[PDB]
Design a protein around this ligand. Structure first.
Ligand SMILES: [Zn+2]
Ligand SMILES: [Zn+2]
Ligand SMILES: [Zn+2]
Ligand SMILES: [Zn+2]
Ligand SMILES: [Zn+2]
Ligand SMILES: [Zn+2]
Ligand SMILES: [Zn+2]
Ligand SMILES: [Zn+2]
Ligand SMILES: [Zn+2]
Ligand SMILES: [Zn+2]
Ligand SMILES: [Zn+2]
Ligand SMILES: [Zn+2]
Lengths: 257, 257, 257, 257, 257, 257
C-alpha cells in the first residue's frame, strides 16, 4: 500500500489520521540548475526518495512535494541568474508551507516532518511554520508538532565523510551538483545523470561577503560548486542508507508510537 | 529526449529557449478528495499526462506541476471540509503563478500554456497572469504571451459527449470524480482506481445559491458529484485523443513556428 | 422606513440587529463598459435594485454596495482593455469583503447575503468570505452564515425563459449588455438606456481557451456579447418580479424569521 | 448630460478623456455612526454632492464613490466600537485607491481630484496615491497629477466660520455629526435628518493622548463629538456654496483648460 | 540602573515584567531633513530623551526606538523629495508596530506607551496597534493597553506658549525644524545644532489641498516650515520640563501602581 | 565631522552623495537575550561600532541601525521563547530593507553595505535586497550595488583564532553570548557586561534537525550557547582591530574611490 498521500483515497487517508499517531512528511525542493551532468529537479527527487524510504520503514505518509523553492544564492547554488532555475519569492514559499500546515491541522494531523532538499529554502520554511503555529494557537491548538531538517545534515559519520570527501568535508553549501547529490542520483535515477559531462574544476571559493547584483564570474562556468568526478552509485547507496536510517530513528524519537 | 524541463540539464533548456519559438507548459492541479474509488492527486496526474502527450507532438517542454490548488468548492469539488483535500489560499496560488512567469521571462521564454486540471483554480491563475504581465510591462517586456485552458473544455464534439454521457451532459462542475476523470485514470493509471468501490448515486443537485460555512449534507457522502459507474479505459482513450489533438492544434495556432 | 443601512441612524441599526434574526444584504458590482446603448454602473444598479425589493418584502437591510469589482474577462464582460471599465485587483476585492464581514460580525450580525452583479467577482467573494470566517473561528465564532447568489440564476423556469426569449434562448454566457440586463435597465432606469444605439451583432463565440494579453478582436466592437435589440420594459418587469420572488424565497429558507 | 462616469456609456467616457484635459473626481467616504439624528452614509453623500456641483461648474466627471473608509477614531468620529460603523483595514483602502488610479491611467486619464469626506481616511488615501504614482513611474508615466482634499478645509473665511461657530471654532476633528455636517444635510437631504433627535451635550474634550482599546465612556453617548442643535438649512446652503466655489476655483488653477 | 530595555539582561527585564505593573515605552521617529541648521535624527532623539526622563521619574522602561518613519508630507515635514529623508511604506511601519506589540504581549507585558516624534507616523501607528490588539483578542486577551501620544501635544498651556512665543504664536502645523524642535535640541544636543545656519524665512502657508507628485516649489528652500531664529536653550529647558511632567502625570493616571 | 547620517544636515548628506562614490553602511541587528551577564542590544551595538570605525577609515557614512531583527532560532540565538527578545516577522524585516534601499536610490546613492549583527536576519536581508533591486530595474536603474557581510566572518585567520582561543576553538555555531561577543562588549561597553554573572556551562550541542514549537530544554538555561568565562577586553580589542581592517579592505575592493 502506497506511502504517498496523493496515491491514497480520502477514506484511506482519513483512516490513517484517525489511528492517532500518524506522521506526515513533506519534501521541499526546487527547480535549479545542477551543472552539465545532471537534470534540474534533483532537489525534489532526492528528498522525495528519502521520504519514501523513511515512510516505508516507520509507517508514515508522504505529501506531494514542493517543486519550486527559494532563489538560488551564489555560495550554495551558483546564483539565480542561471537559465532553467525557477524560483519563488520568499513570501510565496512561506505562504505555501503555512497553508499546507493549516490544512493538515484541519484534517486532525498533528505530526509533520518537513524534509528540505534545497539549501536556500530553510528560513522561509521556518517562517511558514511559525506563522501556521501562530494561527493554530489562536484556536487553542498547541499540540501540532513539526520536525524540520535538511536530509544531508544526517550524514555525520567520520567513516562515511572520509569516503565522500577523502580530501576534507567541503561544507553542505559547496555541495551543489557535487559528489553527494550526484552519487545519490547515480544510485536512484542513473538515466538522469551523465558522469562524462562533469566539468572537473577546483571547489568554488568565495570572499567573506556577498554582492548583489550577483557577479556571474564568481561562479564556476558549469554552475556546480564542487566536482562530481568521483561520484559513484556505491557512494549513493551508502548515503541513502545513512540518511534513511538516521532520519527514521530521529522521527521515531520525536514522534513515538 | 524528455519533454520535462525538470529532467533536462540547464544547458539543454537554455539551448531549447535559444532556438526562438519555444513553448512551455505548466500543469496546475490540486490534492483533493476524489471519492472512495480514486486517489487524491488526479488533478495533477491528468493535466500532466495531457501536457506530456501534447508536448511530444508539438515539440514543447513541460514544467514541474503545481501540486496544490485553490480551496475545493461544494458545487465543483465536494467542498473544502473533506479530509485529504489540501488547499492553498488565493494569494498563495496567484503568487506562485506570478513568480513562475517572472522567472520564465528572465530565462528569455515568451510562450506559456497553463493547463488547469482543478476546477476552482481558474480565476487565481488569471490573476497570477495579469500581475505577472503587469510587471513585465514595467520592465519593458510586452511580447510574453500566455494561453490558459482547462483540458476538459476541449471535449466539445456532440458525438463524443453522447458516447461519454448517454443520459446527458451535466456540466464540468458536476464532473468531479465521475465518468470523465475516472475513465482517463483507468486509461492512464489503472492501479490508482478501484471501480468496484464506486458509489452509484444520482448526480448532485444544488439550489441556485451558495452557503458558507459549507454544509456537508449538501454533498453526496462519498465526495463525488456524479457516478463513475460507467467509466471505462475505452472512454479514457477517446477523451485523451480528443484533448491531445484539440490542444495541440490550439497551441500550434496560437504559437506557430 | 428605509431598507438601506446607510439611510438609518446607528440606533435604528442597532435595534434591528438586536432583534436576533436580522438579514443583511450586500450588493457587489462593477464599473464596466456595457455597450454603446447603456451606462457603466449597471452591475451595481441592478443587484442594488433587486436587493431593495427583496429587503422590502422580507424585512432585511441593504448595505452600501461595492462599486468596483474584479477585472473584466473577455468571455464574460468583454475584457479589461476597454476604457471606462475600472477594476480592482483580486486581493483588494477579497480584502474589502473580508473587512465588511469582520465589522458586521462585530455589530452582532450573523446573517449575510452577498448579491453579485458582476460574474468575474465570484471567486474573490468566495475567498473574502473564507478568510473572514477563518478569523471568526479564531474567536470561537461559528454561527455567522453567508449566502452568496447571482440574481440571474433565479430565472430558471423554462416558461419564463420562453416569454423572455421567444426566438430561442442562446445561453447565459453571452448576457453581457444583452437582452437580460438591458430589459432590467429599461424597467428600472430607462433614461440610462438608448435602445437605438444598440449594435445588432451576432452572439459572441470563443475557443475553449483564453489568451493574455487579451486580443481585442475577439470581442465584438461595441463590447456587448449579444444584441439587446429585442430588450423591453415588459421583459424587465418580468425578470424583476421573478428574481425578487425567487431570492426572497431562498433567503427565507436559509434565514427563517 | 450627467457628470457621473457610471451614468455614461464607455464611448461617451472615451470621448471625454480623448479631449485631452479631462478632470476626474473620486469621492472617498465611509459608513459611520453620526449620532441619533442623522443617517450613517453622510460621509459618502456630502462629498458626492459637492463633487457633482463642482463637476457641473468646471466640466469634470465624477467616479463612483468609495463607500467604506478607515476605522473611526474616538477623537474624530466617536470610535470604531459603535454599531453600524463599517470600516476597512488601512491596506484595503490604500489598495482600492491604488487600483483605481492605475486603471484611470490605463484609460489615458491624467487628472484626478480625490475628495475625502471622512476624517480618518486621509493618510491611507495619501499612501494609495504614492504607491500608484510609484508604479506609474515604473511604466514611464510621470504626467499623472492628483489633487487631494477634505472638502471642509475649504471653509476658511472667518466670516463663514463665525456664522457657524459664534462661540468659537474648536476644530474639524471635533466636528463629527455637529453643526457643519447636519446643516449640509438639512440643505441637501432633509429627510435623512431629524433635528428633534439631536442630543444637546457639551463639546467633547480629550486629553493630549489616545487610549486603545478604545474606551466608550470617553465619547459622548450619542456618538456626536459636538451638538448640532443650531444647524440649519440656511447654514447648509452657505457651506455648500463656499465649498463648491472654492474647490472649483482650486481645480481650475491646478487643472487649467 | 538603566531605564533602557536594550541595556538590561533578559533576566532583569523578566523580573521587571514579573512585578505586575510594568510600563514599557516605545519612541517612534524618523530620519528626515530638518533644515540647514539641524541634523536628521531629531524625531528619534527627542522622544527618546523625553521617554528616558519620564521613565526615570515613574519607574518605566524604554524600548529601542523606531528609527525610520512614514513618508514626509509637504505640509508637515517639507516633503519626501528631499535628500536624506529615508521613509518607510505605511505597511512596513504598521507591521513593525504590530510585531513589537505581539512580542511584548508574549513576554507578559500589558502596558505600553508609544511616543511619536514624527507627525506623519500617527495613523500607521494606530493601524499597527489595532492589528496587534485584534490578534490578542483571538486569544481572549483584552488587558493589553496602549497609550499613544505625540510629545508636543503636552505643551498646551497658553501660559507656557506665552513664555515660548512672546511676539506671537503661529501654530503647530509649521513646527518642523522651527522654534520648538530647535530649542529642545539646543538644550539636549547643542553639538547637533548650529543656529548660525538658520535660514530666516516667513512661515510656510499652503492652500487647503495637496498635490502629488509633490511640487518642491511649494516648500521653503531650506526644508523648514518655520524659522528657528528665536530658538534657545532656555526655551528648550522649559519645553522639556513641561513635557516630562505632563507625560509622567498622564502615564501615572492611565497606568497606576 | 560625524560619520552618522542621522547627525548630518540634509545639505551635508546631499553634498556627500553628490561627490559620486559615496559608500553608505547599514547596521542590522536585534533586541535579543544574551545570557545573564550581558544586555540585549548587543547585535545592534556591535555592528554599529564596527561600522563607525570602518566609516572613519574609509570615508563612508552610517545609517540608523535596524534595532529589531528576525525571530531568534534555537541553534543560533537560543530561541524566540525567551523574554526580552523582541522579533519581527520575515515580511516586516524584508520590507524595511526594501524601503531603505528604494529611498537611498532616490537620493542618488548607489553603494550600500549591510552589516548584519544577528545571524537569523540573513535571508530576509537577501530577499529585501532582491525585491529592491527588482524595482530599481523597473525604473531603469541597474547601477545600485549592495555588499552584505557579517562582521564575524572577518576573524578568519587561524593565527588570530589561536590567540583568541588558546584552550581550543569550538566553532562559530555556539558563539551567541560567548567569548566573541562578550570580549567585544568588554572592549567597547564594559558597563554593559558583568562577567561575574557568566554561567560556565558546557557548549551547546543539538541533533541534526529542528523542532517547533521550540523545546526550551534544548537551550542552556542562561540562553548562551557557549561560556564567556574567558572573555576579555584584550580579546575584544584584537577582534575589533582585525574586523575593522578586513572590512575596510573588502569595501575598498568592492567600492573603489
Ligand atoms: Zn541540489
Ligand atoms: Zn538547490
Ligand atoms: Zn478532479
Ligand atoms: Zn478538483
Ligand atoms: Zn453587467
Ligand atoms: Zn459585469
Ligand atoms: Zn461625517
Ligand atoms: Zn467620518
Ligand atoms: Zn522633526
Ligand atoms: Zn518629522
Ligand atoms: Zn548576539
Ligand atoms: Zn542574535
Amino acid at each position: 500500500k502506497s506511502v504517498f498521500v496523493g496515491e491514497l483515497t480520502w477514506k484511506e487517508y482519513e483512516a490513517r489520521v484517525a489511528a492517532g499517531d500518524c506522521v506526515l512528511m513533506l519534501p521541499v525542493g526546487a527547480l535549479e540548475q545542477h551543472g552539465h551532468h545532471m537534470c534540474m529537479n534533483v532537489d525534489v527527487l532526492l528528498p522525495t526518495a528519502v521520504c519514501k524510504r523513511v515512510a516505508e520503514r516507520i509507517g508514515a505518509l508522504v505529501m506531494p512535494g514542493l517543486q519550486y523553492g527559494y532563489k538560488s544564492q551564489q555560495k550554495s547554488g551558483g546564483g539565480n541568474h542561471f537559465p532553467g532555475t525557477t524560483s519563488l519569492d520568499g513570501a510565496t514559499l512561506t505562504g505555501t508551507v503555512q497553508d499546507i500546515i493549516r490544512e493538515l491541522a484541519r484534517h486532525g494531523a498533528r505530526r509533520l516532518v518537513l524534509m528540505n532538499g534545497h539549501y536556500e529554502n530553510s528560513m522561509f520554511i521556518v517562517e511558514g511554520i511559525d506563522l501556521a503555529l501562530r494561527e493554530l494557537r489562536y484556536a487553542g491548538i498547541q499540540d501540532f508538532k513539526v520536525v524540520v531538517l535538511s536530509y544531508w545534515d544526517f550524514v555525520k559519520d567520520p567513516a562515511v565523510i572520509q569516503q565522500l570527501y577523502p580530501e576534507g568535508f567541503l561544507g553542505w553549501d559547496i555541495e551543489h551538483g557535487g559528489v553527494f547529490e550526484t552519487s545519490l542520483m547515480l544510485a536512484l535515477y542513473p538515466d538522469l545523470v551523465d558522469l562524462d559531462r562533469v566539468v572537473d574544476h577546483p571547489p568554488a571559493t568565495f570572499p567573506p561577503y556577498d554582492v548583489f547584483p550577483v557577479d556571474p564570474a564568481r561562479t564556476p562556468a558549469p554552475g556546480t560548486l564542487s566536482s562530481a568526478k568521483t561520484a559513484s552509485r556505491e557512494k549513493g547507496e551508502l548515503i541513502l542508507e545513512v540518511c534513511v536510517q538516521g532520519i527514521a530513528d530521529a522521527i521515531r524519537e520525536e514522534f513515538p508510537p
